[PDB]
Amino acid sequence: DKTRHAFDGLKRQRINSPMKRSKDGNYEDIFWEEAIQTISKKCLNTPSDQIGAIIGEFADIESITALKDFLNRLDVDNFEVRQHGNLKVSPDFRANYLMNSKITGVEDADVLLLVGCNPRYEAPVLNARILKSTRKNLKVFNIGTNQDLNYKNVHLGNSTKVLKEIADGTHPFAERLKKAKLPMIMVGASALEREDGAELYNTLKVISNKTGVISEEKSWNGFNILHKEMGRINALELGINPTSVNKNAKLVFILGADNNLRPEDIPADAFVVYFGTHGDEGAYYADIILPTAAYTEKNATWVNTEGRVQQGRLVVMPPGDAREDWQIIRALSEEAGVPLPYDSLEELRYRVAELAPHLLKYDYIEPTIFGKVALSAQQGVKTTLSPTPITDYIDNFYMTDAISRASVTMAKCSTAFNHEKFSNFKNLAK
Amino acid sequence: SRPGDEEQNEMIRIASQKRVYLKHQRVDRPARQEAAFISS
Amino acid sequence: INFGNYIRERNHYRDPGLIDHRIQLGYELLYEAEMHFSQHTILMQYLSPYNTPLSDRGYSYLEKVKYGNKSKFLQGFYKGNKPTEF
Amino acid sequence: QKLIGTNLRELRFVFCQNSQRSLGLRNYIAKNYWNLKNQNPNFPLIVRECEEADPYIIARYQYGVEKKAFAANNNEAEIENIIKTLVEQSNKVN
Amino acid sequence: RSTQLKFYDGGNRQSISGIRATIFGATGFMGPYIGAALGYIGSDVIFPHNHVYAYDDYVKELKLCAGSGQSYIMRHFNYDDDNMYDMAIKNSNVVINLVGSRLQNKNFQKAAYANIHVAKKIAEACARNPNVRRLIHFSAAGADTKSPSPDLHTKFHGEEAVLNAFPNATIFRPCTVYGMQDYFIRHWIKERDWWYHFNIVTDDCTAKRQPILINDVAQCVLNALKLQESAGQIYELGGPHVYSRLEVFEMLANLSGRPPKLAHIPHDIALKITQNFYNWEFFNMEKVIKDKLDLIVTGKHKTISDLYVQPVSFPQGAEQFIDDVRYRGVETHDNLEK
Amino acid sequence: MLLPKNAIQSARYFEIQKIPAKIAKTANEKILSVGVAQKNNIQPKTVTAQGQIGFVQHPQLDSSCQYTQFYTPQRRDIRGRVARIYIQDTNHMHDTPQIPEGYKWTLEFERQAQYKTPWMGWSFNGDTFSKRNHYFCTLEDAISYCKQMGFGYEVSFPRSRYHTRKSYADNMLWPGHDNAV
Amino acid sequence: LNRMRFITAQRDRSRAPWQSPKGEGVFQGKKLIVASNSPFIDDMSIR
Amino acid sequence: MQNKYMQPIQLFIVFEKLNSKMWISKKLNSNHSIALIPSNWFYSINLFLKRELLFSNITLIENSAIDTISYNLETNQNDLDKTNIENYFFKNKMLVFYNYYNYFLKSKLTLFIILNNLNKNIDSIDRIFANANWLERETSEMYGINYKWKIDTRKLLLDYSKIENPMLKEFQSEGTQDAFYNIFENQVVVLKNETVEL
Amino acid sequence: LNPYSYEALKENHWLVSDSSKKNSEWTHKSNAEQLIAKVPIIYVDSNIVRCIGGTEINAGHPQVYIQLDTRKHGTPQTCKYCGLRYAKKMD
Amino acid sequence: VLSNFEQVNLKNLRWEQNFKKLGLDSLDQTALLASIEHEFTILFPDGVFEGFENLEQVVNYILKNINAV
Ligand SMILES: CCCCCCCCCCCCCCCCCC(=O)OC[C@H](COP(=O)([O-])OCC(O)COP(=O)([O-])OC[C@@H](COC(=O)CCCCCCCCCCCCCCCCC)OC(=O)CCCCCCCCCCCCCCCCC)OC(=O)CCCCCCCCCCCCCCCCC
Ligand SMILES: CCCCCCCCCCCCCCCCCC(=O)OC[C@H](COP(=O)([O-])OCC[N+](C)(C)C)OC(=O)CCCCCCCCCCCCCCCCC
Ligand SMILES: NC(=O)C1=CN([C@@H]2O[C@H](COP(=O)(O)OP(=O)(O)OC[C@H]3O[C@@H](n4cnc5c(N)ncnc54)[C@H](OP(=O)(O)O)[C@@H]3O)[C@@H](O)[C@H]2O)C=CC1
Ligand SMILES: [Zn+2]
């Protein structure tokens, strides 16, 4: 329902011109030339040490590639400014941050264990597929919150004690996994985004290797990660490290990020340039605002959670004076004096091929033969978890992103369904 | 006989071939792709 | 020279039949121009310079002054390609 | 191998996973990725696999400067030599 | 306030330029051209007018500037009512003023009214309306308080009043503009055709002239709108070169093939006759007075180069407008075909 | 929409199936020469209705595009544009349309500026070229048309339902013994 | 004379511009604090 | 079909090197017959028609062309049979059809010619049938057929100083340019096209 | 009676209501809503009422049938073609 | 006449070099020959028009011609 009725957000609260905010806080419209010139002057003045960036939720391959090239030419290497929550996963191998088993792997696995994941709220179609699989042959276990899943599940726990026991092998679920053939482990990105995300990730790696989730004889790799940000998936695909965080940044480039932003993340004295399409959030932290295109208005590439690379096509042109984000970055680089080697989509995609060629095979999942190496458990790692519950980030299914927040149908759905769906208890009927 | 008679015959031959549509062609669910791992 | 540029844009043709058809059309349009069948403003589109100002008008170099030594991509980006009102 | 972090800003290996032309680089990466990672904990070592792709080692040094080395039909010793040259040339580059 | 104007000039008549413009005094020679300049890119154009006769082609052709739904004609305009101006410029972010004393008017009171009262009221209305981003008033080159010409004398005060009321107003001071419907080339042709033997001059014909093409003037208007910094400054627009009246006569004669003949009438008697008899387009005191005066671009204000418009030379620009009126002497048989 | 396998084996047919490999000409392309080589090595060598990997082919402004008619003094943007070639299936709303779809390849052009005029709120298109889609019986014909007219083309291959066993007896199934665990 | 209302309504049917803050406003670090303009009531937060 | 009808087999009896493909349907008149004729024999066939005894009293009623490249069966796709004439439309660039009426035989004869060459070359017959002049001029201009040995190739029903083939399925009904009046040029000009979409 | 309240939305089919009925004058360029609201509820004995929007076929809207046997007794039901509201004469 | 064609430098002009050396393609050559015909009010037969290879040949032909104005 979100993907069916959230397009209404694109119809209002749309930024349609470059804007600048005065110290008093009075926004005023300006020309693209003026905005780019002032941004370039700020970039030249600011040393590369105190320049940082934030990746948005709806960032695409082309935009992230242009931003990465521009920051590299400016000598900026840190692409995160938020320190509260960062995804703890290395972008070296695709196998270590993509679902090794495809979306159809649930139809093949016999046991599926979720860690901090709520498929009903995130990827409901995946939840329906899991329902089909569990009705045919599949047993579902859950470590975290006990959400009202449409199918029966075995709730092992909510703390990291269960993970510690499984890793140590004293938990009976270790024997259960060993008995089971083609087991699958699905972990939500929030669990890896926890402060101990690296420790939890290492614990999952060792558990998978010990229990055979990654088996050469079975030729099976059941380790999976369910993401919550298409922009984060694209950044990982292009190789941007999510852990690289600039603690103190004087010049912040927010590429359409509206979730998790807080005043503490942006230093009071910083200069903020926000590439965005809606003004719900991130447009109030911005000293300069640059309109960008949406997914229905940008001819770009998108990599989904399972690693499938698809092409998002242009339906209608960006509203008002909005420009494509990659074009904006190209113009900014040229004005700042570090021109990028691509002037069109074809040349930008040639650069994308330079970085990672597999993104030029649209609607296809490129296999990787380094899954075992990437997910192998190293010796001497921390693997020390915290005694706290594992939770799910989604609270209101109908309000998760800026477009949904700006949508009217989503607001009607929220007011009509939140009170009826909220329940601190579990539906024992199912 | 003129030179183009062969081309005309080719056109007539190709015009008589049976034709089917992708929409009505059966497609079976592919089997699970066997994951491969680099040795050593 | 302008009509020469027009022909140069089409010089890549390698089909004798298409070339013959094009020559027939060209002779027809030339005859129309001779006989005043066409209007001067309608037929001067073939003779007009590709990148040079018309000799009977004063040209504006504001765009060149503003975007001196800037890539065509940046010039087009600043110019825009869609009305901004809607 | 211990100075990769300071010498370079990124290392990338783009190759094919089922081609003899890439076999050498493929095997070298599979064998030495963890060694290099342990030597340089936080350095970015990206690995990308695409069928029928030319082997390439891309070293990004600084200020958006990159050098691409064609590593086709190269033994593991040749890959070691190329990587060592790329690491050592950082001083000359900057 | 803000003088910025965001408009798209890459579209044709059916596009949306982003300019909503009210053009006062568009029934003159230059009015249709200025209106078409904005209309052809998709801008909305309003033409307030109180013109006699209503059925004149001058009023009629204003509808061709933009098209259907974009060009509007506001008839029976009252020039002494502020509500009329408010209605005219209510939805316009551009206000162009070309309301100046006609060459047919010799009354100082009427000239002052046209060149001062209307301009000041338009400027006051623009000041009242906060949505009027740009104001472009059309003055005359050589405007001065000591100028003998009542037109120039009143136009200087008019531009001063416009600047006082609306400090962000842009004042143009074009030189003698020529074109198909101008008062210079057409007047030359018509006078020589009506006399058939001479053009009647009333001075030594040493006055300097710097003609500019109306297309160049329109391009200057567009460039001034594009350039935000042009607001609140005075511009003098003219051709690349300066010619005297005698040189202009010689150039026109050479271009058209018509032998020149200038018949001199004493300036004093001509002035007395024109000031004591009825005046119309082809017989007026303003022409007699302006014959002696110099109407050229001075270095005291900004020039056309500042607007970044390269005007075309007078010999090249005026040649096309005299093709029909060409001397028919000895010509080749091939040229006889026509 | 599918002639018999290897029914046509003409040189022209094989040429239509084959896609050219780009040659770096622009300065940007020369700078990205490695990218061009990678794209040439990776993209599918030939186009057939049995293909499964989508790809984008640049416009081939060569002697082959001499048959285009959309290169005129007034308009010079139609040629070299990029189209989309895919099968348009029936909407999910209904299953038995009066005029069924999915029996032909649709060629589409991304729409340019679309604005509602102020006087009446009527929709206007900046360009009139991309209003209607084009239809072809075969992907080979569509690609041949693109090559002849000098348009670049993305190709996205269709996806259809997987055949599954269907039987009314599946409604009645014996769950099993009660004691079963 | 009221063409502006109709034009704005037609433009908003497809795309409604975001109303940016004007004048002096409260600041929390590098953030401008503005009350939500959504007519809908946040029932879950209220109760 | 309760009339006396005979196939026009004389053409194929005389032109012994050609194969016959003929149709008659109740969708047409009782005395109407369609046939397939190759382009390289079209001119000679018309020569024979114009002066054969029983075909002497023959008049070229109509002539036109069809852009068969974009032809698709939108309904009842499976009902198509190999004997239907529609099978020759698929994958063929153009199909030019002529229609004649014969008075001696009280018959109507249509000939279909398939053009597969990209330049659409075909021999004209306006030198045999006088009224074919303007018919072929219209066909050539509207569909771009390159008629050869034609009496007059000048356009007919198309605007001055313009080159286009509007009837091709690629072309859009709204055209590519609109004619307005320019005040600066004081005359009618032609510029790019912007139209209304319902 | 807040038009955006959950109760109001549920009662009005999740549409924002206009009690004054004046906004329609601009939204739909007519006062037909105000005019039709004046007609009172028509009470019909039968459980099902037939409406043709006139006195004879083809003089109104297509013949339609409205169920007056609501799950809650006496609830008026509005015709879709015309705004006439019919209710069962509960006794 | 050549002054119109700004590709060629009239200063260091060799009358024996080919039009291609001067910097004129076939279309430029045809335009230049037509311009020379207009200048001298003459008409080059097809054979000589196509046979011209440099400016010296044109000069010699015009010198021999008596109708040149
Ligand atoms: C009968 C009773 C018995 C007793 C006898 C009584 C007297 C009998 C008289 C018999 C002859 C009568 C002849 C006139 C008939 C009626 C027409 C007429 O009056 O002229 C208007 C008529 C209007 O011109 P048109 O060709 O019809 O216009 C066509 C379009 O409108 C033009 O279209 P366009 O698009 O080309 O427009 C161009 C522009 C014009 O073109 C231009 O743009 C360039 C010119 C602009 C300035 C024009 C200023 C005026 C120029 C006057 C020129 C006069 C001609 C001679 C010049 C000689 C120079 C050396 O248009 C105009 O402005 C048109 C001209 C306007 C003229 C306004 C003044 C006219 C009335 C006063 C004339 C006085 C002339 C005195 C001459 C000396 C007499 C000794 O023609 C003239 O203007 C020339 C008239 C010349 C003769 C005047 C005779 C009356 C005065 C004689 C002196 C006093 C009496 C002496 C005898 C007393 C005996 C007791
Ligand atoms: C059959 C009818 C014939 C009618 C012929 C009429 C001839 C002209 C009569 C003029 C009467 C003037 C009365 C006194 C004016 C007082 C005002 C003044 O200041 O005097 C100086 C006037 C004023 O002109 P001015 O330019 O000096 O000053 C303007 C006035 N102030 C300063 C107040 C603003 O000028 C004159 O010399 C007299 C008026 C000349 C008018 C010329 C146009 C006449 C139009 C006639 C139309 C009818 C045509 C009939 C034939 C139609 C055939 C189809
Ligand atoms: N050679 C030239 O063209 C030059 C022109 N200019 C300036 O540019 C302006 C436009 O050029 P141009 O078209 O030639 O000028 P015009 O004389 O042709 O036009 C003047 C306009 O003002 C109107 N007008 C005149 N008097 C009044 C009045 N008392 N009250 C209200 N409206 C009046 C006129 O309408 P109506 O028809 O009803 O009288 C007309 O529309 C000139 O007015 C002049 O100020 C400056 C230098 C040279
Ligand atoms: Zn009813």
SS3 for I8-51, per residue? HHHHCCCCCCCCCCCCHHHHCCCCHHHHHHCCCCEEECCCEEEE
Which residue has tokens 């005297």? E244
Q: Cβ atoms within 10 A of the Cβ of E112, count?
A: 18
Q: DSSP assignment, residue H189?
A: E
Are E165 and E120 in contact, with CB atoms under 8 Å apart?
yes
Are F125 and F114 in contact, with CB atoms under 8 Å apart?
yes
Identity of the residue numbered E335 = N
- Which residue, I3, I24, I27, is CA-closest to I15? I3
CA distance B16 to B18: 7
Q: Which of residues 4-63 of D touch F (CB under 8 A)?
A: 14, 50-54, 56
Question: Which ligand approaches the C-alpha of residue E194 most closely?
Answer: 1
- Tell me the chain A residues in contact with residue G23 when contact means C-beta distances shorter than 8 Å: 24-26
**Ligand 1: residue whose CA is nearest its atom 55:** E195
Query: CA-nearest residue of chain A to D54?
Result: A357
Question: Which ligand approaches the C-alpha of residue I54 most closely?
Answer: 4
Resolution of the coordinates, Å: 2.8
Angle, helices J26-40/C2-9, rounded to nearest 10 degrees: 150
Q: Is E242 annotated as a binding residue?
A: no
Q: Cβ atoms within 10 A of the Cβ of F165, count?
A: 5
Q: Is E198 in the pocket of ligand 1 (CB under 6 A)?
A: no
Buried b (16+ CB within 10 A) or exposed e, H2-36: eeeeeebebbbeeeeebeebeeeeeeeeebbbbbb
CB contact under 8 A, H195 and F125: yes
Would you call F122 an interface residue with chain G, using a CB distance cutoff of 8 Å?
A: no
| E–B touching, 3+ CB–CB pairs within 8 Å | no
Task: Tell me the backbone φ, ψ of residue E22, rounded to 5 degrees.
Answer: -115, 125
Q: Subunits that touch chain E (at least 3 Cβ pairs < 8 angstroms)?
A: A, C, F, G, H
CB contact under 8 A, F113 and C83: yes
User: Residue J46: which H helix or E strand, with range?
Assistant: helix J46-51
CA distance E150 to E155: 8
Which of E23, E24, E29, E105 should be mutated for ligand 3, with most atoms under 8 A from CB?
E29
- Contacts C–F by Cβ distance under 8 A: 29
Q: Is E297 in the pocket of ligand 3 (CB under 6 A)?
A: no
In Å, the largest CA–CA distance within chain B is 70
Question: Which ligand approaches the C-alpha of residue E75 most closely?
Answer: 3
Query: CA-nearest residue of chain F to A314?
Result: F110
CA distance E31 to D85: 74
Secondary structure in 3-state letters for A55-75: ECCCCCHHHHHHHHHHHHHCC
- Tell me the chain J residues in contact with residue C8 when contact means C-beta distances shorter than 8 Å: 27
Burial of residue A65 (number of CB atoms within 10 Å: 0-12, 13-18, 19+): buried
CB contact under 8 A, B7 and H114: no
Identity of the residue numbered D87 = V
CA of residue E257 to ligand 1 center, whole Å: 28
Are E284 and E101 in contact, with CB atoms under 8 Å apart?
no
Identity of the residue numbered H28 = L
CA distance F21 to F41: 9
Cα-based distances in Å from H163 to C25, C60, F69, I21 = 8, 31, 8, 58
Would you call B10 an interface residue with chain H, using a CB distance cutoff of 8 Å?
A: no
Report the phi/psi class of residue B26: left, alpha or beta, with left for phi > 0 and alpha for psi in -120 to 50.
beta
- Angle formed at CA E33 by CA E32 and CA E37, multiple of 5 degrees: 115
CA of residue E23 to ligand 3 center, whole Å: 12
CB contact under 8 A, E11 and H186: no
Query: CA-nearest residue of chain F to A358?
Result: F42
- Tell me the chain F residues in contact with residue D21 when contact means C-beta distances shorter than 8 Å: none
Which residue has tokens 């110290």? A23
Secondary structure in 3-state letters for chain A: CHHHHCHHHHHEEECCCCEEECCCCCEEECCHHHHHHHHHHHHHHCCHHHEEEEECCCCCHHHHHHHHHHHHHCCCCCCECCCCCCCCCCCCCHHHCCCCCCHHHHHCCCEEEEECCCCCCCCHHHHHHHHHHHHHHCEEEEECCCCCCCCCCEEEECCCHHHHHHHHCCCHHHHHHHHCCCCEEEEEHHHHHCCCHHHHHHHHHHHHHHHCCEECCCCEECEEEECCCHHHHHHHHHCCCCCCECCCCCEEEEECCCCCCCHHHCCCCCEEEEEECECCCCCCCCCEEEECCCCCCCCEEEECCCCCEEEECCCCCCCCCCCCHHHHHHHHHHHHCCCCCCCCHHHHHHHHHHHCHHHHCECECCCCCCHHHHHCCCCCCCCCCCCCCCCCCCCCCCCCCHHHHHCHHHHHHHHHHHHHHCCCCCCCCC
Q: Is E82 in the pocket of ligand 1 (CB under 6 A)?
A: no
CB contact under 8 A, B21 and F103: yes
- Two tokens at H25? 């349907």
- Contacts C–J by Cβ distance under 8 A: 8
Q: Subunits that touch chain H (at least 3 Cβ pairs < 8 angstroms)?
A: B, C, E, F
Contacts of E18 (CB under 8 A, 6+ apart): C83, C84, C85, E5, E6, E7, E8, E42, E43
How was this structure determined? It was done by cryo-EM
Would you call J2 an interface residue with chain C, using a CB distance cutoff of 8 Å?
A: no
Q: Is E183 annotated as a binding residue?
A: yes
CA distance I58 to A395: 55
Are E42 and E14 in contact, with CB atoms under 8 Å apart?
yes
The alpha helices in chain E, defined as continuous H runs, are 31-39, 57-60, 82-88, 108-112, 118-128, 150-165, 185-195, 214-226, 245-256, 267-276, 285-292, 304-307, 314-317, 333-336
Identity of the residue numbered F100 = P
- Two tokens at D55? 């082997």
Q: Is E244 helix (H, G, I), strand (E, B) or coil?
A: strand
Q: Is I13 annotated as a binding residue?
A: no
CA distance H167 to H120: 15
Which of E27, E50, E178, E281 should be mutated for ligand 3, with most atoms under 8 A from CB?
E27
Would you call E16 an interface residue with chain H, using a CB distance cutoff of 8 Å?
A: no
Q: Is E283 in the pocket of ligand 1 (CB under 6 A)?
A: yes
- Which residue, A383, A237, A365, A284, is CA-closest to A25? A284
Q: Cβ atoms within 10 A of the Cβ of A216, count?
A: 14
Q: Is E284 in the pocket of ligand 3 (CB under 6 A)?
A: no
Most A CBs within 10 Å, among B28, B33, B40, to test the A interface: B33
Cα-based distances in Å from B10 to A391, B17, C75 = 70, 11, 53
Question: Which ligand approaches the C-alpha of residue E150 most closely?
Answer: 3
Are A159 and A388 in contact, with CB atoms under 8 Å apart?
yes
- Tell me the chain B residues in contact with residue D27 when contact means C-beta distances shorter than 8 Å: 38, 40
Q: Is the dihedral of CA A15, A17, A23, A26 positive or negative?
A: negative
- Tell me the chain B residues in contact with residue F105 when contact means C-beta distances shorter than 8 Å: none
- Two tokens at H65? 């062309």
- Which residue, H96, H109, H136, is CA-closest to H49? H109
Q: Is E100 in the pocket of ligand 3 (CB under 6 A)?
A: yes
Query: CA-nearest residue of chain D to A361?
Result: D50
Q: Is E179 in the pocket of ligand 3 (CB under 6 A)?
A: no
Q: Alpha carbon J47 to chain centroid distance?
A: 14
| E–C touching, 3+ CB–CB pairs within 8 Å | yes
Would you call F33 an interface residue with chain C, using a CB distance cutoff of 8 Å?
A: no
| J–D touching, 3+ CB–CB pairs within 8 Å | no
Query: CA-nearest residue of chain E to A32?
Result: E6
**Ligand 2: residue whose CA is nearest its atom 21:** E278
- Two tokens at A266? 């942006």
Q: Is E113 in the pocket of ligand 1 (CB under 6 A)?
A: no
| A–E touching, 3+ CB–CB pairs within 8 Å | yes
Task: Tell me the backbone φ, ψ of residue C49, rounded to 5 degrees.
Answer: -65, 150
